[PDB]
Design a protein around this motif. Structure first.
Motif, PDB file in Angstrom:
ATOM      1  N   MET A 110       8.347 -75.911  45.651  1.00 14.11           N
ATOM      2  CA  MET A 110       9.204 -76.751  44.719  1.00 14.11           C
ATOM      3  C   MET A 110       9.891 -75.900  43.904  1.00 14.11           C
ATOM      4  O   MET A 110       9.326 -75.354  42.958  1.00 14.11           O
ATOM      5  CB  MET A 110       8.206 -77.701  44.052  1.00 14.11           C
ATOM      6  CG  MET A 110       8.757 -78.860  43.361  1.00 14.11           C
ATOM      7  SD  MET A 110       7.717 -79.953  42.626  1.00 14.11           S
ATOM      8  CE  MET A 110       6.310 -79.099  42.180  1.00 14.11           C
ATOM      9  N   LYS A 111      11.312 -76.278  43.892  1.00 12.72           N
ATOM     10  CA  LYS A 111      12.171 -75.710  42.878  1.00 12.72           C
ATOM     11  C   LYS A 111      12.213 -76.392  41.730  1.00 12.72           C
ATOM     12  O   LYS A 111      11.878 -77.471  41.333  1.00 12.72           O
ATOM     13  CB  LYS A 111      13.629 -75.746  43.578  1.00 12.72           C
ATOM     14  CG  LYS A 111      13.936 -74.907  44.979  1.00 12.72           C
ATOM     15  CD  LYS A 111      13.487 -73.416  44.799  1.00 12.72           C
ATOM     16  CE  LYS A 111      14.226 -72.842  43.611  1.00 12.72           C
ATOM     17  NZ  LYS A 111      13.765 -71.322  43.522  1.00 12.72           N
TER      18      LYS A 111
ATOM     19  N   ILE B 173      10.863 -79.794  39.755  1.00  9.80           N
ATOM     20  CA  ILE B 173       9.858 -79.634  38.637  1.00  9.80           C
ATOM     21  C   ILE B 173      10.489 -80.336  37.229  1.00  9.80           C
ATOM     22  O   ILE B 173       9.773 -81.080  36.692  1.00  9.80           O
ATOM     23  CB  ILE B 173       9.331 -78.369  38.418  1.00  9.80           C
ATOM     24  CG1 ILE B 173       8.828 -77.708  39.714  1.00  9.80           C
ATOM     25  CG2 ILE B 173       8.464 -78.234  37.510  1.00  9.80           C
ATOM     26  CD1 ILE B 173       8.625 -76.374  39.882  1.00  9.80           C
TER      27      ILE B 173
ATOM     28  N   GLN C 135       0.363 -81.173  39.137  1.00  8.65           N
ATOM     29  CA  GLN C 135       0.642 -80.643  40.385  1.00  8.65           C
ATOM     30  C   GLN C 135       0.186 -79.135  40.002  1.00  8.65           C
ATOM     31  O   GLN C 135      -0.104 -78.311  41.134  1.00  8.65           O
ATOM     32  CB  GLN C 135       2.416 -80.544  40.069  1.00  8.65           C
ATOM     33  CG  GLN C 135       2.872 -79.793  41.539  1.00  8.65           C
ATOM     34  CD  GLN C 135       2.494 -80.387  42.791  1.00  8.65           C
ATOM     35  OE1 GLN C 135       2.774 -81.690  43.007  1.00  8.65           O
ATOM     36  NE2 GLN C 135       1.935 -79.600  43.697  1.00  8.65           N
TER      37      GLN C 135
ATOM     38  N   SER D 219      -1.729 -77.752  43.023  1.00 11.33           N
ATOM     39  CA  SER D 219      -1.219 -76.254  43.654  1.00 11.33           C
ATOM     40  C   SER D 219      -2.228 -75.106  43.540  1.00 11.33           C
ATOM     41  O   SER D 219      -2.506 -74.410  44.447  1.00 11.33           O
ATOM     42  CB  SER D 219       0.034 -75.742  42.931  1.00 11.33           C
ATOM     43  OG  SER D 219       1.042 -76.818  43.029  1.00 11.33           O
TER      44      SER D 219
ATOM     45  N   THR E  35       4.048 -68.709  48.665  1.00  9.68           N
ATOM     46  CA  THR E  35       4.889 -69.898  48.307  1.00  9.68           C
ATOM     47  C   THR E  35       4.413 -70.762  47.390  1.00  9.68           C
ATOM     48  O   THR E  35       5.022 -71.162  46.258  1.00  9.68           O
ATOM     49  CB  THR E  35       5.212 -70.703  49.713  1.00  9.68           C
ATOM     50  OG1 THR E  35       5.788 -69.655  50.482  1.00  9.68           O
ATOM     51  CG2 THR E  35       6.208 -71.875  49.337  1.00  9.68           C
ATOM     52  N   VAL E  36       2.955 -70.849  47.401  1.00  8.38           N
ATOM     53  CA  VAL E  36       2.169 -71.874  46.463  1.00  8.38           C
ATOM     54  C   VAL E  36       2.093 -71.088  45.011  1.00  8.38           C
ATOM     55  O   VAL E  36       2.601 -71.699  44.004  1.00  8.38           O
ATOM     56  CB  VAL E  36       0.706 -71.864  47.147  1.00  8.38           C
ATOM     57  CG1 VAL E  36      -0.104 -72.800  46.037  1.00  8.38           C
ATOM     58  CG2 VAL E  36       0.569 -72.735  48.359  1.00  8.38           C
TER      59      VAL E  36
ATOM     60  N   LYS F 207       4.509 -69.067  43.455  1.00  5.57           N
ATOM     61  CA  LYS F 207       5.919 -69.045  43.201  1.00  5.57           C
ATOM     62  C   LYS F 207       5.986 -70.341  42.521  1.00  5.57           C
ATOM     63  O   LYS F 207       6.744 -70.725  41.467  1.00  5.57           O
ATOM     64  CB  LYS F 207       6.783 -68.711  43.925  1.00  5.57           C
ATOM     65  CG  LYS F 207       6.546 -67.239  44.365  1.00  5.57           C
ATOM     66  CD  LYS F 207       6.533 -65.943  43.265  1.00  5.57           C
ATOM     67  CE  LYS F 207       5.839 -64.911  43.588  1.00  5.57           C
ATOM     68  NZ  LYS F 207       4.551 -65.097  43.950  1.00  5.57           N
ATOM     69  N   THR F 208       5.510 -71.502  43.271  1.00  4.14           N
ATOM     70  CA  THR F 208       5.453 -72.955  42.621  1.00  4.14           C
ATOM     71  C   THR F 208       5.110 -72.987  41.341  1.00  4.14           C
ATOM     72  O   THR F 208       5.244 -73.684  40.484  1.00  4.14           O
ATOM     73  CB  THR F 208       5.086 -73.722  43.771  1.00  4.14           C
ATOM     74  OG1 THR F 208       5.873 -73.626  44.960  1.00  4.14           O
ATOM     75  CG2 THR F 208       5.291 -75.268  43.640  1.00  4.14           C
TER      76      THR F 208
ATOM     77  N   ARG G 264       6.530 -71.547  38.450  1.00  4.01           N
ATOM     78  CA  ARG G 264       7.614 -72.257  38.053  1.00  4.01           C
ATOM     79  C   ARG G 264       7.467 -73.664  37.400  1.00  4.01           C
ATOM     80  O   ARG G 264       7.902 -73.792  36.322  1.00  4.01           O
ATOM     81  CB  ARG G 264       8.577 -72.833  39.495  1.00  4.01           C
ATOM     82  CG  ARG G 264       9.533 -71.851  39.987  1.00  4.01           C
ATOM     83  CD  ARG G 264      10.301 -72.348  41.121  1.00  4.01           C
ATOM     84  NE  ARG G 264       9.279 -72.332  42.543  1.00  4.01           N
ATOM     85  CZ  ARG G 264       9.479 -71.840  43.543  1.00  4.01           C
ATOM     86  NH1 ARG G 264      10.371 -70.789  43.847  1.00  4.01           N
ATOM     87  NH2 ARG G 264       8.587 -71.904  44.413  1.00  4.01           N
ATOM     88  N   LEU G 265       6.404 -74.158  37.564  1.00  6.78           N
ATOM     89  CA  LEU G 265       5.761 -75.169  37.180  1.00  6.78           C
ATOM     90  C   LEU G 265       5.328 -74.780  35.686  1.00  6.78           C
ATOM     91  O   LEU G 265       5.478 -75.548  34.796  1.00  6.78           O
ATOM     92  CB  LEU G 265       4.276 -75.689  37.784  1.00  6.78           C
ATOM     93  CG  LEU G 265       4.767 -76.597  39.117  1.00  6.78           C
ATOM     94  CD1 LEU G 265       3.471 -76.452  40.026  1.00  6.78           C
ATOM     95  CD2 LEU G 265       5.169 -77.904  38.795  1.00  6.78           C
TER      96      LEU G 265
END
Ligand SMILES: [Mg+2]
Length: 65
Positions: free
Chosen positions: A1-2, A6, A17, A21, A45-46, A48-49, A52-53
RNA sequence: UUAAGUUAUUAAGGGCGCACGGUGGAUGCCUUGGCACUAGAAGCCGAUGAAGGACGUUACUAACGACGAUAUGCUUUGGG
């Protein structure tokens, strides 16, 4: 998710989230440990999300302060 | 045939020359790293926790670099 997606999420939504995650990442780690995971790229991938969160959450808190 | 006299061949191995190999890393060529300076800039960092480390972080990680549990990166603004 970018980050943009978010940013749309509410603070509570981000927190939920983050929990979701982290559980997914844990599952992937146990799957990799048991040799059941082929799609190893999912793990990163998880991760990095989640990063970001947390970043968006921090940005909001600083903005509040 | 006998007598007297004379002189070879031997190379176990060695010597000299030559040829062909091996070893070794000199030499030549080369440069990734140095050395000495010039000009401009700059001449501190730290309790808002330094310098320097330790331990970690990758799909698989012994080591180096990078990074810090948001870990082999995250966001944003510009470049491309
Ligand atoms: Mg850009």
């Amino acid at each position: 998710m970018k980050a943009k997606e978010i940013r749309d999420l509410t603070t509570s939504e981000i927190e939920e989230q983050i929990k979701s995650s982290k559980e997914e990442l844990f599952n992937l780690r146990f799957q990799l440990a048991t040799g059941q995971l082929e799609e190893t790229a999912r793990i990163r991938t998880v991760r990095k999300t989640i990063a970001r969160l947390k970043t968006v959450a921090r940005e909001r808190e600083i903005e509040q302060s």
